[PDB]
Design a protein around this ligand. Sequence first.
Ligand code: 3O7
Length: 272
Amino acid sequence: PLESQYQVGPLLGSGFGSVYSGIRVSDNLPVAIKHVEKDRISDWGELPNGTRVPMEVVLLKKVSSGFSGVIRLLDWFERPDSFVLILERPEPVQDLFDFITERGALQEELARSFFWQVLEAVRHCHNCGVLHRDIKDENILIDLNRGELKLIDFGSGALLKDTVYTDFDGTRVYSPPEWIRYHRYHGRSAAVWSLGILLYDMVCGDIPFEHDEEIIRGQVFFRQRVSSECQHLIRWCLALRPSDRPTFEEIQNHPWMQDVLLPQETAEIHLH
Ligand SMILES: O=C1c2c(O)ccc(O)c2C(=O)c2c(O)ccc(O)c21
């Protein structure tokens, strides 16, 4: 059913897997086709109907209902040594790591719009019972035309829970001090930490911390001019003590978050 119903094109990256550009035949929706090999999956789950699948798929199904800032799972298949996922492919697109790498640090107005959309997308996941655990520039795609950000790689994700996590598969330089020191964290507050790393990156062109010692020390130096309110929000997300970090609500009610542009205006002003 698979090679009949879609048409493969160029590789796009790897790997989280190996992803090819693809076209649905039924109608020419761009799609992306991700192959994941059974032998590299450390982490499995089960769907409603009760089949044994990779967590990624569990997590993607939970979040793919309706619209949002997540790239949606349109379908999937099993093969003898691999699973294969069919995902949306917006067109044209660029990931935030490449975008930042090309244009350097981002004007506050642009960072505010982007950051807001990441916030909405993460709220959506938490809502659906999903925690991403690897929120970073390269897991965000920009739809250059509509100005809409989309989250992508759920392969380190987990079901959201209130219990304390003991495993972590995401990026180190994005991991919170509680993980570095004690090998334990909670979802929401670890996510806020990483959101804080992300926001620094947006406005400074680079991440704040490289080594464990700098993460655990939690002192943030700004290498770029950044308003006083943005520094405050960033420092707040990057508090050492989990309980001293903001909730999403508080981040979203922060002064620096006010009067966010809509996506379309963001694209006009900053992407056209
Ligand atoms: O690299 C992608 C990806 C992509 O490169 C282009 C369009 C896309 O739609 C995705 C995508 O949905 C995607 C994903 O869900 C997980 C890991 C990934 O590396 C990716």
